[PDB]
Write a protein that binds this DNA or RNA. Structure first.
Ligand SMILES: [Mg+2]
Ligand SMILES: [Mg+2]
Ligand SMILES: [Mg+2]
Ligand SMILES: [Mg+2]
Ligand SMILES: [Mg+2]
Ligand SMILES: [Mg+2]
Ligand SMILES: [Mg+2]
Ligand SMILES: [Mg+2]
Ligand SMILES: [Mg+2]
Ligand SMILES: [Mg+2]
Ligand SMILES: [Mg+2]
Ligand SMILES: [Mg+2]
Ligand SMILES: [Mg+2]
Ligand SMILES: [Mg+2]
Ligand SMILES: [Mg+2]
Ligand SMILES: [Mg+2]
Ligand SMILES: [Mg+2]
Ligand SMILES: [Mg+2]
Ligand SMILES: [Mg+2]
Ligand SMILES: [Mg+2]
Ligand SMILES: [Mg+2]
Ligand SMILES: [Mg+2]
Ligand SMILES: [Mg+2]
Ligand SMILES: [Mg+2]
Ligand SMILES: [Mg+2]
Ligand SMILES: [Mg+2]
Ligand SMILES: [Mg+2]
Ligand SMILES: [Mg+2]
Ligand SMILES: [Mg+2]
Ligand SMILES: [Mg+2]
Ligand SMILES: [Mg+2]
Ligand SMILES: [Mg+2]
Ligand SMILES: [Mg+2]
Ligand SMILES: [Mg+2]
Ligand SMILES: [Mg+2]
Ligand SMILES: [Mg+2]
Ligand SMILES: [Mg+2]
Ligand SMILES: [Mg+2]
Ligand SMILES: [Mg+2]
Ligand SMILES: [Mg+2]
Ligand SMILES: [Mg+2]
Ligand SMILES: [Mg+2]
Ligand SMILES: [Mg+2]
Ligand SMILES: [Mg+2]
Ligand SMILES: [Mg+2]
Ligand SMILES: [Mg+2]
Ligand SMILES: [Mg+2]
Ligand SMILES: [Mg+2]
Ligand SMILES: [Mg+2]
Ligand SMILES: [Mg+2]
Ligand SMILES: [Mg+2]
Ligand SMILES: [Mg+2]
Ligand SMILES: [Mg+2]
Ligand SMILES: [Mg+2]
Ligand SMILES: [Mg+2]
Ligand SMILES: [Mg+2]
Ligand SMILES: [Mg+2]
Ligand SMILES: [Mg+2]
Ligand SMILES: [Mg+2]
Ligand SMILES: [Mg+2]
Ligand SMILES: [Mg+2]
Ligand SMILES: [Mg+2]
Ligand SMILES: [Mg+2]
Ligand SMILES: [Mg+2]
Ligand SMILES: [Mg+2]
Ligand SMILES: [Mg+2]
Ligand SMILES: [Mg+2]
Ligand SMILES: [Mg+2]
Ligand SMILES: [Mg+2]
Ligand SMILES: [Mg+2]
Ligand SMILES: [Mg+2]
Ligand SMILES: [Mg+2]
Ligand SMILES: [Mg+2]
Ligand SMILES: [Mg+2]
Ligand SMILES: [Mg+2]
Ligand SMILES: [Mg+2]
Ligand SMILES: [Mg+2]
Ligand SMILES: [Mg+2]
Ligand SMILES: [Mg+2]
Ligand SMILES: [Mg+2]
Ligand SMILES: [Mg+2]
Ligand SMILES: [Mg+2]
Ligand SMILES: [Mg+2]
Ligand SMILES: [Mg+2]
Ligand SMILES: [Mg+2]
Ligand SMILES: [Mg+2]
Ligand SMILES: [Mg+2]
Ligand SMILES: [Mg+2]
Ligand SMILES: [Mg+2]
Lengths: 274, 44
RNA sequence: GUCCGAACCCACUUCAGUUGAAAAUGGAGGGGAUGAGUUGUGGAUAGGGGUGAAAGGCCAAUCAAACACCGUGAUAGCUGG
RNA sequence: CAAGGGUUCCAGGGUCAAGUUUGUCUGCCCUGGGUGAGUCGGGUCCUAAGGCGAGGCCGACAGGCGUAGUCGAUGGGUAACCAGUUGAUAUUCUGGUACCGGCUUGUCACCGCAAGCUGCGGAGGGACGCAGUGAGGUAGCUCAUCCCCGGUGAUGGUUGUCCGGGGCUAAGUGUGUGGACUGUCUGGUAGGUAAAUCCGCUGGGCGUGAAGGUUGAGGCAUGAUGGGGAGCCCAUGGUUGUGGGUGAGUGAGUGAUCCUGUACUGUCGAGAAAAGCUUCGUGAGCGAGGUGGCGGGUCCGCCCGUACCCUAAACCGACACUGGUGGAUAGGUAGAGUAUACCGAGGCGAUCGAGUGAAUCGUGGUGAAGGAACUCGGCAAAAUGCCCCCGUAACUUUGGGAUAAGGGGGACCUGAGCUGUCGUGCACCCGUGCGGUGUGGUGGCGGUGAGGGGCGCAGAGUCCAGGGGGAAACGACUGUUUACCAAAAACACAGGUCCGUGCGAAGUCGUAAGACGAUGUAUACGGACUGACUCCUGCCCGGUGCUGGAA
RNA sequence: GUAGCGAAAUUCCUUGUCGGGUAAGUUCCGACCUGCACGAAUGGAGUAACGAUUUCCCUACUGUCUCCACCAUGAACUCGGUGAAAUUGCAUUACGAGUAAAGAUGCUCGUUACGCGCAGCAGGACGGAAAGACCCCGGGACCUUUACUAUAGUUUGGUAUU
């Protein structure tokens, strides 16, 4: 759930945290960890290519099994549910029934003890990985591949969910968490259920230092810059950009997806609007 | 106060040493030009 | 990213200094002082470029485009000789 | 000590220059000398960030990136301590006592498609955050009637504990106290790049309800009949050290920033790598019927640094410059304190002086009566200030406001009882041969003290150390910023909304490959604006932009 | 131009008007609405806590002041040692009233004035320092845009690959 902080200090007034009640373990599995040095948003040219990245807590990376199809037919017991600093979701540590241990994204309602399995003949239960051909139409899935064998790509963050709406032909039409209807090969894999930790979007970080130690550097509005720095910069006193809003590089707002892209497998656009 | 020159021999050798100059054609031409002038010190 | 307060980091006021003890400090107070803290060692980003909690700020003691050398003995309807 | 410097170090000779003066002196000049490592810090070992990078990919050329690899500490690993000695070196030399790796050797025991050695990897291990409290110790420190060495005091007293001083020893080895860890015997096996008997995952049987085994804070024993530690001898030579002469080694109080301890507890922001190391095989070779292991004995153990300065007169500042410069040790009394005051260990008297009641400038001090009348402005200063007890407003987001405000006490002498700890002993469980557990103690030491009393102008008597309250504007807050005239109302912020993005994402650096985004996946990422919180955020799509459409 | 706010970090007139605070208040706080020229995420109105922010008031306190006096110190002063600097056309370098490139040590007419030092003060030497930074003129740089001309990028189709 969410534990609200008492306003003993400013910056702590309206803030809230997770209660970490799903976590059955406070430590990770050592064999599935790798070092993850920070980048600072810096290229291999050494230049800042993504702004507002820097510092934060040191984090080790947990190797997540995004394929799941190389252990078809080998049942796995959910040994633990634990914290992953690298994602907003919790991760389930699975003990496969042959000695291998792996990490997956913990689905909603999968607790310590549920036996999961992969394969075409797998049961339709949360935590089971199946090809979309062997998944009934209307099932809520997550960790959905885009092309067969490629690994899980869509529906991976906390509370994320993909709905299988149709299977007419070689393509299965699925509804992505953005509201975009899409077609993917029926040979693409997906895990049954939705992603857990769905209540984490309601956390109030309450405090600049909490975003500072999540690795986020401060963002300066382009309107309080100088004209050499931003197209919105300049002016006596407070202004707007003095023009239609643009990026720091002068790009006007508007659709940026390439229309010549070979993804003619798009049924309806996401339609965010408001 | 703190001044501009804070000596570090490791950093000095990594920045201006002979092998650093040899690593690039600009540094090689710098060494050639210092040979042409006649410097008794070609690098740091 | 609690409070008072040393080390430490800073620099609000005032006095002095202003051919200084010092090309930015000293005395007296002052702010932060478990944090978005501070610091050593090595490293990365380079000039129409970097970096910037954004002052056109900083990039080796004068940056609205560093420094060095070269074009070059630039050009000056201007000043001087 | 590090960095940095580089001979400045020591000895002798010197006084042109340097030294803000003089100088017989010197960090200066000249001559000579001085730095000793199997164990300390680096390499010979390992990797982080990052660099380079066989092939390769990308790019008119120049070049960019990167695989296999190879470097790269600020980190991991790795065997030694005490004392002594020089003018100058000392975990380096010397004495004593250790440890580590090789080579060889006496000896014991065991192997043998099937020894071993080396490569090659698997696994375990190394291996990791932050904050906090308590316990058991030890270092240190204090006191002492106890023990040793000395003194009997220029001036009233000072032969009883009155006065001063000292009350010490390492690494290593053994023991195993507190503390900590840990069931036992077999079976199977989609995994661990080749395999595994070493690991992982599972199944049984037995199993106290703890008992053994393993380890090792400190203590003890050894190391140590050794080493260190004052004043007294025919005489030393009279600013010096030699042979005797070393004497003591206890007890209590307090007590860490050190150890147990990577413990334990809490916690979200979820906290390197690789090698050494243990074991398991065998994707390589070597290798013979030779080897590996255990007490014992020989010899071998490399390269670089080592002087000296180092919160500085030797480094960065042009200076022998009131500046800057990372780490370690850091005692006593008062004190909460690493503040401040005075002292210790130790080191200094500062690199022009001598005078002189001029004005004046700087730096401090005091001040009648008044008390902001000063001034742009209470600028500056004064007042306040500490601990304990009492008491505390509007408003509030219930946390605050708050040390609100405003009141009382404090130091000294004496002191009933109340306590922490130890103690010779009274009994008592004793597994005694353990390094003990529980009631139990004339007394010592420490903490605290109701009550009574003394003195002064004054008892937080010194140094140290908030003035307080009321109201408005802005920003919610903590933070950030114009190095060197602006610290703010500016920036950021947590929160909000809009737009873009379906993943080779969008966006950005780049000619490109690539890369960051992100080993992330729409509860995510990027851009824009607004900026806690509360109540709200109205009308207009004409213009321009954006999105869609196409007669 | 709604809610809300309004002589406001916005109000020219303006010290608007009325009230409070003072003996006296161009500031301040509360209103009014006549908004030169507020206004709802360049957010509107509020807001506990916070602020070396800005503003007004009360109290305490004082050398801030009425109105200064005294004390000690580092300079200043004297002696011995050592020993600069900026600046400098000159020089045996007065004052008044004039005159002059219109503000004179230097010219005129007068007045005053023995030579040389030491400590002081700052009225002048249009004092020194800096080829004025304000203003104009010539040149430059950087910034902006529906200035011009280009161009990277983005996009349209044709053609080659096909
Ligand atoms: Mg961003
Ligand atoms: Mg992350
Ligand atoms: Mg600005
Ligand atoms: Mg622009
Ligand atoms: Mg404006
Ligand atoms: Mg704080
Ligand atoms: Mg504070
Ligand atoms: Mg600053
Ligand atoms: Mg570098
Ligand atoms: Mg500006
Ligand atoms: Mg500079
Ligand atoms: Mg310029
Ligand atoms: Mg230019
Ligand atoms: Mg030319
Ligand atoms: Mg040396
Ligand atoms: Mg010499
Ligand atoms: Mg010398
Ligand atoms: Mg010497
Ligand atoms: Mg000498
Ligand atoms: Mg001299
Ligand atoms: Mg001499
Ligand atoms: Mg590397
Ligand atoms: Mg090549
Ligand atoms: Mg190396
Ligand atoms: Mg090191
Ligand atoms: Mg020495
Ligand atoms: Mg020694
Ligand atoms: Mg020896
Ligand atoms: Mg391993
Ligand atoms: Mg392992
Ligand atoms: Mg780990
Ligand atoms: Mg203790
Ligand atoms: Mg004693
Ligand atoms: Mg006598
Ligand atoms: Mg295998
Ligand atoms: Mg196996
Ligand atoms: Mg030495
Ligand atoms: Mg100095
Ligand atoms: Mg020193
Ligand atoms: Mg120097
Ligand atoms: Mg410092
Ligand atoms: Mg002390
Ligand atoms: Mg002190
Ligand atoms: Mg001493
Ligand atoms: Mg000294
Ligand atoms: Mg002096
Ligand atoms: Mg002297
Ligand atoms: Mg001197
Ligand atoms: Mg008096
Ligand atoms: Mg008075
Ligand atoms: Mg009085
Ligand atoms: Mg009064
Ligand atoms: Mg007045
Ligand atoms: Mg007044
Ligand atoms: Mg007046
Ligand atoms: Mg003041
Ligand atoms: Mg004061
Ligand atoms: Mg009070
Ligand atoms: Mg009493
Ligand atoms: Mg009192
Ligand atoms: Mg006002
Ligand atoms: Mg108001
Ligand atoms: Mg603020
Ligand atoms: Mg602040
Ligand atoms: Mg400034
Ligand atoms: Mg300032
Ligand atoms: Mg935000
Ligand atoms: Mg793209
Ligand atoms: Mg990437
Ligand atoms: Mg917008
Ligand atoms: Mg704003
Ligand atoms: Mg605002
Ligand atoms: Mg006005
Ligand atoms: Mg008025
Ligand atoms: Mg009035
Ligand atoms: Mg609106
Ligand atoms: Mg406005
Ligand atoms: Mg608006
Ligand atoms: Mg307010
Ligand atoms: Mg003199
Ligand atoms: Mg005239
Ligand atoms: Mg005249
Ligand atoms: Mg004449
Ligand atoms: Mg004179
Ligand atoms: Mg003067
Ligand atoms: Mg002048
Ligand atoms: Mg001029
Ligand atoms: Mg121009
Ligand atoms: Mg085309």
């Amino acid at each position: 759930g969410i534990r609200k902080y008492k306003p003993t200090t400013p910056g702590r007034r309206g803030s809230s945290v997770s209660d970490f009640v799903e976590l059955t373990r406070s430590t990770p599995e050592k064999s599935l960890l790798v070092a993850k040095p920070k980048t600072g948003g810096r290229n291999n040219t050494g230049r800042i290519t993504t702004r507002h990245i820097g510092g934060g807590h040191k984090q080790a990376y947990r190797i997540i099994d995004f394929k799941r199809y190389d252990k078809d037919g080998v049942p796995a017991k959910v040994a633990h549910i634990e914290y992953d600093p690298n994602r907003t979701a919790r991760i389930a540590l699975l003990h496969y029934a042959d000695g291998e241990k792996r990490y997956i994204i913990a689905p909603d309602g999968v607790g310590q003890g549920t036996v999961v399995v992969s394969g075409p003949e797998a049961d339709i239960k949360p935590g089971n990985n199946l090809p979309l051909r062997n998944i009934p139409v209307g099932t809520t899935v997550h960790a959905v591949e885009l092309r067969p064998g490629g690994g899980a790509k869509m529906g991976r963050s906390a509370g994320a969910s993909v709905q299988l709406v149709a299977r007419e032909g070689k393509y299965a039409t699925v509804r992505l968490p953005s509201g975009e209807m899409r077609m993917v090969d029926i040979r693409c894999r997906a895990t049954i259920g939705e992603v857990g930790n769905a209540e984490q979007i309601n956390i109030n970080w309450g405090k600049a230092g909490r975003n500072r130690w999540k690795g986020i550097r401060p963002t300066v509005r382009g309107v309080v810059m100088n004209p050499i720095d931003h197209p919105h910069g300049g002016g006596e006193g407070r202004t707007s950009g003095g023009r239609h809003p643009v990026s720091p590089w002068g790009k006007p707002e508007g659709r940026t997806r390439n229309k010549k892209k070979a993804s003619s497998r798009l049924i309806v656009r996401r339609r965010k609007s408001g | 106060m703190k001044r501009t020159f804070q000596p570090s021999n490791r950093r000095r050798a990594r920045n201006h040493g002979f092998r650093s100059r040899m690593s690039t054609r600009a540094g090689r031409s710098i060494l050639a030009a210092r040979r042409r002038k006649g410097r008794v010190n070609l690098s740091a």
